[PDB]
């Protein structure tokens with residue numbers, strides 16, 4: 390039966406750095422790209438939608454535009470990996486990766502963000 | 516493009532009563548049951564999972580045990596309707612209905628629950 394798994398369910402990252410969080414799913418030697426759907430979101434903001442083997446940019450959230458991409462190279466290994474550059478305090482929260490490949494499943498990932506005072510203060514008046 | 520829609524995105528219900536919330540999805544011609552997946556959850560608890568045309572209760576949250584059913588009659592109309600009997604204060608919150616049928620999509624529904632004092636008080640301690 391179809392199942393998504395996470396190697397890690399918690400990431401602790403530094404304000405200003407780059408992050409890759411991952412969802413694994415089974416591919417039996419070889420990917421059928423036509424049938425694959427990958428959707429990632431955080432608190433109901435869309436981050437990427439990979440359908441018919443291509444990213445759809447239209448429905449991506451503001452926060453994420455050209456900061457967030459799916460590492461397409463990994464897909465044939467059964468790895469939907471999300472890369473986000475220049476982490477902000479507001480990137481902290483619970484992420485879900487939703488995968489349709491025959492079956493469907495999803496998983497959740499918690500992101501914590503450490504930040505120095507000047508950064509936390511700017512966010513404190515948001 | 517495949518889309519799930521909600522006729523209503525907010526329900527206000529009374530403690531002790533029965534609730535049916537709804538999610539529409541497109542069905543052309545005849546319904547293909549083999550391909551259909553319907554999943555409902557609230558705050559990461561599984562409520563029902565209908566796959567290969569059958570409910571799988573093994574994975575159900577114990578809150579919902581024998582209170583929750585999917586109206587199977589409605590499916591061929593393109594309606595995934597969830598019924599919960601004997602609504603409790605703890606059933607208030609955000610529900611998501613997730614559907615795979617060719618494409619995949621989800622929607623969100625908020626349920627509020629009115630309750631009298633005696634009920635709220637018992638919940639206030641437990």
Ligand SMILES: Cc1c(/C=C/c2cc(CN[C@](C)(CO)C(=O)O)ccc2C(F)(F)F)cccc1-c1ccc2c(c1)OCCO2
Pocket residue numbers: 393426427428487488489493494495496497552553554561563564565566574613614615619620621
């Ligand atoms: C993920 C999914 C599902 C899966 C849900 C699900 C979930 C869990 C629950 N997962 C865990 C947490 C661990 O495994 C558990 O706590 O158990 C268990 C069982 C199932 C099932 F069988 F019902 F599907 C159902 C329909 C659609 C989608 C879906 C996929 C891709 C999408 C999309 C929707 O819409 C936007 C575009 O991209």
